[PDB]
Amino acid sequence: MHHHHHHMVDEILKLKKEKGYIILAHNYQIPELQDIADFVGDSLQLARKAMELSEKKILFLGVDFMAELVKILNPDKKVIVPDRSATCPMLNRLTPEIIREYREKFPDAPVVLYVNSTSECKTLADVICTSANAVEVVKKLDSSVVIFGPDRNLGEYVAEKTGKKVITIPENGHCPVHQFNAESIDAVRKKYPDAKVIVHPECPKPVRDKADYVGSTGQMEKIPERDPSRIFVIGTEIGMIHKLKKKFPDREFVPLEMAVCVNMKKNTLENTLHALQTESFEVILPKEVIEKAKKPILRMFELMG
């Protein structure tokens, strides 16, 4: 790090301790922010941590739907984010109106919503899932047909793994960050014939099918615990490469392609420091949304164990 960044890092750590904040970050945050965070993980790990933490003030570094999930789980704690416009482009593509439309079209099918969804959409869900637990959650539902959204690729992954009929909504909700080309895997196979290829379930099927492993970022981080490969090629957002290299410094981690989530990068050292200085921006939800959205979130944990 450089002298000017060094100064903000020290101030952030001092303010965090002084004001009683715990700092939660997602795996795609920039390295300088992961390094000042108290806990870094994927959505399921952040959710589980949000139910276990004891601090009264939380600074969340990620995108809005995650921050609001943490707030829904802690309605009486203060949650702040540095930039409220950090979001996911899939959120705008699924709406309460579309969910009601498809409930009417397919009555007697549960609505399973990926965590990358608005909090208002969550109030209409039967259950929430992340990419790590989507297969298990859907498997434990009684119905052989489910409505799933917004991510079509994750829904199709779930249908392959469960054999259930997964009606995805909207027509083509997808993560642009994970739209790798399958040819990139062909190329690394020739360049690194002994490497293992790990990709995200948000990837298109041709990419998933040519990979050695498919999983959430939390699952990716545990693969080198059981796979001795010297080299791993990583098909997810670039911020996870830094996470992996820090945790397993004696392996090599090659990005499948350079892929950057511009929304995840909206959080900087500068606006994270200002957030602690001003205790803003607070994450505020209508009380009815918290009331109704907590039920499908709690159900997600109930269907895991």
Return binding residues for [4Fe-4S] cluster.
88, 175, 261
Nearest to Cl ion of 138, 264 (CB atom) = 138
How far is the C-alpha of 242 from the C-alpha of 132, rounded, in Å? 20
How far is the C-alpha of 155 from the C-alpha of 165, rounded, in Å? 10
Annotated binding site for iminosuccinate: 26, 43, 114-116, 131, 200-202, 217
Q: How many residues does the chain have?
A: 305
Residues at the interface with ligand SF4 (CB under 6 A):
63, 88-90, 116, 175, 177, 202, 237, 261, 263-264
Nearest to Cl ion of 220, 283 (CB atom) = 220
258, with CB counted inside 10 A (0-12, 13-18, 19+), is exposed
- Contact segment (CB under 5 A) with Cl ion among 54-62, 137-145, 209-217, 273-281 equals 137-145
Per-residue contact string for residues 236-275; x = within reach of Mg ion by CB under 5 A: ----------------------------------------
Annotated binding site: 26, 43, 88, 114-116, 131, 175, 200-202, 217, 261
- What residue 170 binds from ligand SF4, Mg ion, Cl ion, none (CB within 5 to 8 A, per partner kind)? Cl ion
How far is the C-alpha of 149 from the C-alpha of 118, rounded, in Å? 11
Rounded to 5 degrees, φ, ψ at 262 are -60, -30
- What residue 278 binds from Mg ion, ligand SF4, Cl ion, none (CB within 5 to 8 A, per partner kind)? Mg ion
Told to check if 54 binds Mg ion by CB under 5 A, we report: no
Distances (CA, A) of 79 to 43, 59, 92, 266: 16, 6, 23, 17
Told to check if 106 binds Cl ion by CB under 5 A, we report: no
- Residue recorded with tokens 């390094």: 35
- What residue 280 binds from ligand SF4, Mg ion, Cl ion, none (CB within 5 to 8 A, per partner kind)? Mg ion
Q: Does 170 sit behind a cis peptide bond, omega within 30 degrees of 0 on the bond before it?
A: yes
Nearest to Cl ion of 18, 108 (CB atom) = 108
Told to check if 141 binds Cl ion by CB under 5 A, we report: yes
SS3 at position 107: coil
- Residue recorded with tokens 């490469």: 241
Question: 170, 265, 289, 301: which one contacts Cl ion (CB under 5 A)?
Answer: 170
CB of 285 to ligand SF4, least distance (A): 19
Distances (CA, A) of 221 to 131, 134, 227: 14, 18, 11
Question: 193, 258, 278, 305: which one contacts Mg ion (CB under 5 A)?
Answer: 278
Maximum CA extent, the chain: 60
**Hey, what amino acid is at 122?**
K
How far is the C-alpha of 129 from the C-alpha of 61, rounded, in Å? 20
Told to check if 250 binds Cl ion by CB under 5 A, we report: yes
Residues of this chain that bind Cl ion (CB under 5 A): 141-142, 170-172, 248, 250
**Interface residue list for Mg ion (CB under 5 A):** 278-280
